[PDB]
Amino acid sequence: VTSEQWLYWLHLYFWPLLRVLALISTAPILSERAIPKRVKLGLGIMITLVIAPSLPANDTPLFSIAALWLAMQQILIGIALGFTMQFAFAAVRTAGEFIGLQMGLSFATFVDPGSHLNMPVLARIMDMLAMLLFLTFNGHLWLISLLVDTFHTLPIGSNPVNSNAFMALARAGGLIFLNGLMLALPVITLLLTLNLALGLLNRMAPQLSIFVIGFPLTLTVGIMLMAALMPLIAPFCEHLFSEIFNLLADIVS
Amino acid sequence: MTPESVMMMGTEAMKVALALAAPLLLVALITGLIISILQAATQINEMTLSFIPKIVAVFIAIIVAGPWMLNLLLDYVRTLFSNLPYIIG
Amino acid sequence: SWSLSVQTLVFITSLTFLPAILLMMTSFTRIIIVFGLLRNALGTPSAPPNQVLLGLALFLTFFIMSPVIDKIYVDAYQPFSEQKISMQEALDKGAQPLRAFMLRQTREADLALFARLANSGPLQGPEAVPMRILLPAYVTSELKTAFQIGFTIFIPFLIIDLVIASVLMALGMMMVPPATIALPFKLMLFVLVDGWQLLMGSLAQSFYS
Amino acid sequence: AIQGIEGVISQLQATAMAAVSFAGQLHAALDRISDRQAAARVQAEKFTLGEPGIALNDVMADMQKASVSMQMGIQVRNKLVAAYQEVMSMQV
Amino acid sequence: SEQVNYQRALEGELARTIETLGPVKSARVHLAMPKPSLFVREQKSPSASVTVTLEPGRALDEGQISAVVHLVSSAVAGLPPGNVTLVDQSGHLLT
Amino acid sequence: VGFELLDQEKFGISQFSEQVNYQRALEGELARTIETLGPVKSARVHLAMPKPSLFVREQKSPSASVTVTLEPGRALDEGQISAVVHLVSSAVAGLPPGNVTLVDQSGHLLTQ
Amino acid sequence: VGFELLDQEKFGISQFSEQVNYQRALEGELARTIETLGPVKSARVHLAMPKPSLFVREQKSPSASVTVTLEPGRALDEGQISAVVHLVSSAVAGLPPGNVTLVDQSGHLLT
Amino acid sequence: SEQVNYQRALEGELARTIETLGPVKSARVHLAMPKPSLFVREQKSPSASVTVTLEPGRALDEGQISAVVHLVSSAVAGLPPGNVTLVDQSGHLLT
Amino acid sequence: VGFELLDQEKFGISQFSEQVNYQRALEGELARTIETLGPVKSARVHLAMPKPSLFVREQKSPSASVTVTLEPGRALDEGQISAVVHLVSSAVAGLPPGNVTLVDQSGHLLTQ
Amino acid sequence: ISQFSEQVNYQRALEGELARTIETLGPVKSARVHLAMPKPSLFVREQKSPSASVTVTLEPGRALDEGQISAVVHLVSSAVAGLPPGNVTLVDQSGHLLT
Amino acid sequence: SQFSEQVNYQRALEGELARTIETLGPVKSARVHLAMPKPSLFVREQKSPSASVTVTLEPGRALDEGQISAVVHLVSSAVAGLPPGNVTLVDQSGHLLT
């Protein structure tokens, strides 16, 4: 009596904690530095407390290279999930920064690339709008649910792994650009026409145009254009989230 | 809470930004266009003399309409912070 | 009941978890995240020397959790101190008002998700939800609410920078940093519209609503 | 409650269709230790009372066992607190 | 605006179908849809008021009142029939 | 005007302007249906949508005032008064009937 | 004197203006309906809607003053005084009837 | 807007097929597609109201009532037949 | 003055100006209605609308001064004086009647 | 073309082709297929099975064989990812349920 | 869009398969419908794709048992991971040939 076998409880509560905390430190909104560290640790601990008793406990000792392989596996799974989720916000940030750069908002990058003078304020605006939308669509709950679900697909125990699968996540790097253009294709196009229009004005009497009349007009036009374009991101926001989620579901397995 | 509300508040925010920035940008654009057409009429072309009256015009713009912008933006922020606890989800 | 040595041991051990109660079961969490986000918004990552924000958050939490603490004291601490309720029942009696506050603010979707993750049976009413389901549901709801509040907070301080950059760009001053100009104006705004009274009242209502 | 009994019958129906924890273990250990200590104390008070049949040998041995059990509980609490402090120091 | 417009469109179509019903010459539907809440308690059920003008002497049958109730209730997400009021051109509650 | 005023295609200064327009349109349509009824020659509906406190979870509810002008001698039935009450209450989210006042062209309170 | 009356004033309207205009419009419509009451020849409604204050332990409530001009000899009925009270109180969010004053063209308090 | 439009288009096609039924001269379908609540005890579910106008004397068969039910239920993700109401031009509930 | 005064509003209007203008307009309309009462030939209303604070020791409630000019010999009735008091008090958010002073053209205090 | 638009268009196209093949069947003069494809949600376990409603107009007196009803069922079920046959309703031009 | 690309690919495969099926002696026209499985935002699960093939035969040109077999094989092979048992073959009269 008075056994309280500690190794069994430790091995039951450790690896799910490692995977949950690995997702927490990288998953969007759950990985933002504004949350105190203890809150994140407690959330991981409580989620593991809820989940672990149902799972089959592992018996590999913590003092073995098998434990190191397990820890590497959990870290890989968590960071892969969090990063694949982060790709959508990366795409939204790309689209916003490009709209802002066609605004002429930061012209110093065309002359001094990476010269400590850059303000992608539109990128930040649409990034926080995307975060608000992600909060509204309860994406984080889904993330937690999928973190739990990847066990049935991929159990804690060391399992063999595949290859082109990693490429898939890396190939998801294309989406950030592709979908990014899909968010910027209308407005930039009209801005392009506006610039074309300015060109027609410069084909008249030489000089006396551009850098004096083009910048304010194009700034105001970009502002009101994409202010009107704001209602458009939400269907595209859901499209981006669905793309990331089903890509994750297909490739994680 | 609904995405319609989110997009409505975003649109109203950025229309507030447009209203804040429109007088200054429009004044600068009008000054630049006027100086450019005067240059075309007089056949004078230096890229620096169009930069001179623009600063003075835009700085006068804050003299004349500055209080209006300051009162509009404060009212927007005040209303947003007051309605914050009713658009929570 | 337990022996007096066991009661003293349990009391001393339970005194350890006070930061955990403050962070994961209290209003403190969504009383901070908002402060950190607002500090990130104004462009002064130090400004109110942290400790100042922590003290303000502690006082706000103490003012907000007052009815819950009062109910716990009148229902659990008072009978326990008068030797009417045992030590192992005062905890159970006092965990109920905190559980109810934890519900009044915890969203549903989270409750459904964490009811599904535990493989628990159907929960027809809120009276069947245990603490193992309410705790992380409340935590997630508080995180989401804090982030929503902070992200609608962030908008005006970016609007000002946007208009500042556009105005600077109208006149051709493309090499002037916009952040350095915008910071005094952001401070002026936060001074003008009662920056703190409105935020304090909004957070307090956000709890009592 | 009436609704509580409704919930009980609902869980019974759930069992029909279908056809402890670390905190529980710690509570059980605390209850066992407290019960042992209370038993030793009660026997000591009975011996001090003068009631027949209670031997000083048994009283002293039971007090010894209760002290050992209390010390075991104290050590378990100390470690458990140390492990919790170690975990809460983990970087996230 | 988008919501209010949706509400007024639903009202219009419902009135339309109600007038289609033989005995009904014109219908007027008013919907009261309340604020939604995604917490764990706050919830309220919507309500409807239906005014019908009948053809000279075309009294609505019981079954008819029942069918109007069903249609209006179904057309409104979570509309409990008991919150549908049907009234005639003279102010008689057919409910 | 009601929804017609909204269909004037006029810029909504702000959400508050939108809310005022919505309140007016509802008032208009309600008055319209009330007049349509036989004994009623013209109706006038005033809605008061309420407002929340600051830190008080205690809540209240909206109110309505309805003035009817009757056709010469066309007195409204008790059932009539009841149906007007029901319609106005339903048309306003969370309007407790007891907060609907119905009055005639002579100033007689037809409700309670 | 008209809802649409203030429904313009160009723009640049500090919300303060938006509220004051609403108040004026409500006053106008209320006076209008009160005039419709047979015995009433003209009505004048003044609203005092307090701007919320976080200084008092609880929120204060608004007040109304109604002046009526009657048709030659058209005295208002008690039930009529009651109906005017009800209408004005309902038209103002949280207006406690007891804070509605009704007065005639001669300065007699009917309330 | 995208959702509301989806709703209108679906309602339209369903009414269309229902009219394309021998005895049916015109059909009107109203869908109430809302958001559900978990652990709210008895929640509720999507609902439909179908009004049919029949050809002079063309009474619908019990099977006809059944087939209309099936079609409408299938066309709406998770529509429990029992939440489909079918009514005639006289206000008789056929379901 | 009064409501008409708030028409030609230049964009440059400080909140302070907004408020002062609102005060003026209220004063004007109140004087207007007070003239409508028969015995009154002209009225003049002065409002003192101030800061609130919280310390119960030093609270200064809103105050009003009303000067009336009567028609030759048209003395105001006690009831009339009461009705003037009620109207002025109601028109000012939180105006305690006891802070309304009513005076005639000869300097007689009609209130208290 | 929005992501939602892209889906709705795919649904419409599938409906069209299915009706087409059903019509080509001898006894069938015209077919109408309605698909209800469901939605995944973070508050449920097994997603609800898709459903289909098929209305056929037959040639004068061309009654469909039990096997004809069966084959229609099979085709419609297969054409919809995870469509459980039992969720396919087949109805004639007179409102008789054939399934 | 990728989704548009995927729809186009599905349509093209259907077309070519119908084409080869018709070219066969007894077959006058063929119609192939493919149901490729789908991805989920949660939960692992394969849904072996499915096919429905409708053939119109030449007047009286009944298909041999071997013919049903060969049609089955071709359609199954043309679809990555198509389990034959998920191929349905039907005639112009609604007789299930598979």
From Swiss-Prot, chain B:
Transmembrane feature ranges: 18-38, 55-75
Family: Belongs to the FliQ/MopD/SpaQ family.
Topological type in the membrane: Multi-pass membrane protein
Entry GO terms, CC: bacterial-type flagellum basal body; plasma membrane
Record's subcellular location: Cell inner membrane; Bacterial flagellum basal body
The protein's role, per its UniProt record: Required for the assembly of the rivet at the earliest stage of flagellar biosynthesis.
GO biological processes: bacterial-type flagellum assembly; protein secretion
Gene name of the encoded protein: fliQ
Protein name: Flagellar biosynthetic protein FliQ
Any single Pfam family the record assigns to this protein: Bac_export_3
Disulfide bonds, paired cysteine numbers: none
Lineage, broadest ranks: Bacteria, Pseudomonadati, Pseudomonadota, Gammaproteobacteria, Enterobacterales
Curated annotation (Swiss-Prot), chain C:
Record's GO cellular component terms: bacterial-type flagellum basal body; plasma membrane
Transmembrane segments: 9-29, 52-72, 149-169, 173-193
InterPro entries, per the entry: FliP, T3SS_IM_P
Membrane topology: Multi-pass membrane protein
Subcellular location: Cell inner membrane; Bacterial flagellum basal body
Gene Ontology biological process terms, A to Z: bacterial-type flagellum assembly; bacterial-type flagellum-dependent swarming motility; protein secretion
Protein task: Plays a role in the flagellum-specific transport system.
PANTHER family tied to this protein: FLAGELLAR BIOSYNTHETIC PROTEIN FLIP (PTHR30587:SF0)
Miscellaneous comment as given in the Swiss-Prot or TrEMBL entry: For insertion of FliP into the membrane, cleavage of the signal peptide is important kinetically but not absolutely required.
Protein family (similarity comment): Belongs to the FliP/MopC/SpaP family.
The protein, known as: Flagellar biosynthetic protein FliP
UniProtKB/Swiss-Prot annotation, chain J:
Induction remark: Inhibited in nutrient-poor medium.
Location in the cell: Cell inner membrane; Bacterial flagellum basal body
Domain of life: Bacteria
Family note: Belongs to the FliF family.
Assembly behavior: The basal body constitutes a major portion of the flagellar organelle and consists of four rings (L,P,S, and M) mounted on a central rod. The M ring is integral to the inner membrane of the cell and may be connected to the flagellar rod via the S ring. The S (supramembrane ring) lies just distal to the M ring. The L and P rings lie in the outer membrane and the periplasmic space, respectively.
Function: The M ring may be actively involved in energy transduction.
Protein name stated in the entry: Flagellar M-ring protein
Organism of origin: Salmonella typhimurium (strain LT2 / SGSC1412 / ATCC 700720)
Curated annotation (Swiss-Prot), chain K:
Places the protein is found: Cell inner membrane; Bacterial flagellum basal body
Domain of life per record: Bacteria
Residues spanning the signal sequence: none
Induction: Inhibited in nutrient-poor medium.
Function: The M ring may be actively involved in energy transduction.
Protein family membership: Belongs to the FliF family.
Record text on subunit structure and interactions: The basal body constitutes a major portion of the flagellar organelle and consists of four rings (L,P,S, and M) mounted on a central rod. The M ring is integral to the inner membrane of the cell and may be connected to the flagellar rod via the S ring. The S (supramembrane ring) lies just distal to the M ring. The L and P rings lie in the outer membrane and the periplasmic space, respectively.
Name of the molecule in the record: Flagellar M-ring protein
Provenance organism: Salmonella typhimurium (strain LT2 / SGSC1412 / ATCC 700720)
Stretch of the intact protein here: 124 to 221 of 560
